[PDB]
């Protein structure tokens, strides 16, 4: 390495990722202080060598060759100019591209190795589901799947399923190719209910045709009031004056778990009853009417069916 920093500024993602039998566009601007380029090579995997104060390594692309054949055809292919632009494209790009691409600069009197990382995975690898950490019933939430892949030549479709079936809500696709960022982004408005919890939410990558590639999938934690079933002994509700009756009050689901719970006869909170068994005994005319369980947790009350007690 001879080269003199001040005199060099580079705008590009230092990572992109992609994967065999796809393609590589690599977003890149600069400016030389020095002025034009004189000379631009390619390598991969360069390595500097002290003997002849020069590099070694492969060269994927020379301004001398490359830059005087018609590239239209060419697998690499150098889409900048002489001062600001250092755009690349692989198409196909390989598995034995992966490693670092060295961008190998020269101007009236400065030279310059700029390198960029190039990830080549051999299958197709996995999307990415982000979620709020913190999803609930009856709440509006924005499912993002980011895939950090985007290339022209490879046009790609992300598609949302649950339980393995594509969702009717309408996604919204994003795509960013720039010197900033290289991305894929799904967004999906969903409105969970207490029944998405432990359900599978999948993101699929998809070739333009809808051939599977890759797929991500979380398994939803869905916060929701406890659903309570209620049950009375007698099971007919129906007693005479003195008889004993017992109300309980199960849990059929609930998260985060329950940690309290209360009964009501006809709207009025029942004292000293924080139990799931409501216990009546020696009952009378009066104690005849409407009653209720109620179990809260972290998220809410929620709120059993009534139970028509009668006492003839
Ligand atoms: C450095 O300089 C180079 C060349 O001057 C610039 O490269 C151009 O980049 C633009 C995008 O920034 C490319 O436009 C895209 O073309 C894709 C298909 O390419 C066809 O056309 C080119 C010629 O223009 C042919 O060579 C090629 O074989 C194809 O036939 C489209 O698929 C793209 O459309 C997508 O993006 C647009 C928004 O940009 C959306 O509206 C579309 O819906 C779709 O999502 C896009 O149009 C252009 O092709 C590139 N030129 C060449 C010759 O390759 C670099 O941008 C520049 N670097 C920087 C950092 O500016």
């Known amino acids: 390495e001879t080269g ?19 393609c590589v566009w ?11 380029l004189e000379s631009f090579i390619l390598f991969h995997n360069p390595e500097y060598n002290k003997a002849t104060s020069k590099f070694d390594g492969t060269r994927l692309y020379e301004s001398t060759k490359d830059g005087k054949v018609p590239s239209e055809q060419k697998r690499v292919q150098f889409l900048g100019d002489k001062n ?20 190998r600069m020269e101007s009236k009197t400065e030279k310059w190795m700029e390198r960029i990382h190039l990830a080549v995975s051999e299958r197709p690898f996995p999307p990415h589901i982000q979620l709020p950490p913190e999803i ?9 799947c980011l895939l950090a892949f985007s290339c022209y030549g490879y046009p790609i479709q992300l598609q949302w399923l649950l339980e393995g079936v594509p969702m009717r809500q309408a996604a919204v696709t994003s795509t960013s190719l720039t010197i900033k960022s290289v991305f894929t982004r799904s967004e999906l408005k969903f409105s969970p209910q207490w029944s998405h919890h432990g359900k599978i939410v999948t993101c699929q990558l998809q ?29 007919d509700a129906i007693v005479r004056e003195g008889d004993s009756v017992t109300m309980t009050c199960e849990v059929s689901s609930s998260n985060p778990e329950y940690t309290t719970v209360s009964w009501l006869k006809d709207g009025t909170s029942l004292k000293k009853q924080n139990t799931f068994t409501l216990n009546l005994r020696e009952v009378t005319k009066d104690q005849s009417g409407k009653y209720c369980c109620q179990v809260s947790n972290d998220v809410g009350p929620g709120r059993s069916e009534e139970v028509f007690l009668q006492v003839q």
């Not at 600001?84 to 961008?103: E, F, R």
């Not at 609930?136 to 993002?144: A, F, R």
């Open 84 to 103: 600001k632009n250092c755009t690349l494209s692989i198409h196909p790009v390989h598995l034995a591209d992966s490693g670092q691409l060295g961008l």
């Open 136 to 144: 609930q019933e009856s709440q509006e939430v924005t499912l993002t």
């Open 26 to 36: 690599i977003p890149c601007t600069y400016r030389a202080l020095d002025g034009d």
């Open 207 to 235: 070739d333009a045709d809808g051939k599977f590639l890759s797929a991500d999938t979380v398994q939803l934690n869905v916060k929701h009031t406890p659903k309570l079933e209620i049950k009375v002994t007698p099971s």
């Open 4 to 22: 003199d920093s001040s005199k060099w500024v580079f705008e590009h993602p230092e990572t992109l990722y992609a994967w065999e039998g796809a």
